[PDB]
Amino acid sequence: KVFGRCELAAAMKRHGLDNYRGYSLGNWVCAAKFESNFNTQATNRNTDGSTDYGILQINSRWWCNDGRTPGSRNLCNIPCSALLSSDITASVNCAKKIVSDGNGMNAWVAWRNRCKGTDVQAWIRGCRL
């Protein structure tokens, strides 16, 4: 599923992500934009052999199991394929764990490089939320 901006904002709010760990909804929408272009089915292989999955590009090195990342962990206790669903619940639940692990949203390098410090409220501008 490819979400619209306001549609994704609403789904993220519906699942408890707005202001989770102090990160406003615009931060989460901005991260999803630059991680996946709002596409729940996005997958990208990393040079180390792990793969990032879904709307928030969650890594199989630590967070989900894909059966092909030797030496990795599965800290969200989910198959990585569950992070590709049209329903964002699994990605949201896992992102809540990631953002709580100590470095906040810096875990998402694209958030640090493209969203952090910017006018992230522009991502939810005009949305009926």
Ligand X SMILES: C[N+](C)(C)CCO
Nearer to ligand X, 8 or 87 (CB): 8
* Residue 52 to residue 54: CA distance in whole angstroms: 7
Q: Is 87 a catalytic residue?
A: no
What are phi and psi for residue 20, nearest 5 degrees? -65, 130
Binding residues for Na ion, rule CB under 5 A, total: 10
Question: CB-side exposure of 74: number of CA atoms within 13 Å?
Answer: 14
Report the nearest approach of Na ion to the CB of residue 87 (Å): 21
Which 59-98 positions form the footprint of ligand X (CB under 6 A)? 62, 75
Strands 51-53 and 43-45: antiparallel
Instruction: Specify which residues 59 forms β-bridges with.
Output: 52
Ranges of beta strands (E only) in 3-81 are: 43-45, 51-53, 58-59
From the annotation, which residues make up the binding site for substrate? Answer: 101
The footprint of Cl ion (CB under 5 A) covers 1, 4, 6-7, 11, 23-24, 26, 39, 41, 54-56, 58, 65, 69, 73-74, 79, 83, 87-88, 91, 104, 107, 120-121, 125, 127-128
The footprint of ligand X (CB under 6 A) covers 62, 75, 101, 122-123, 125
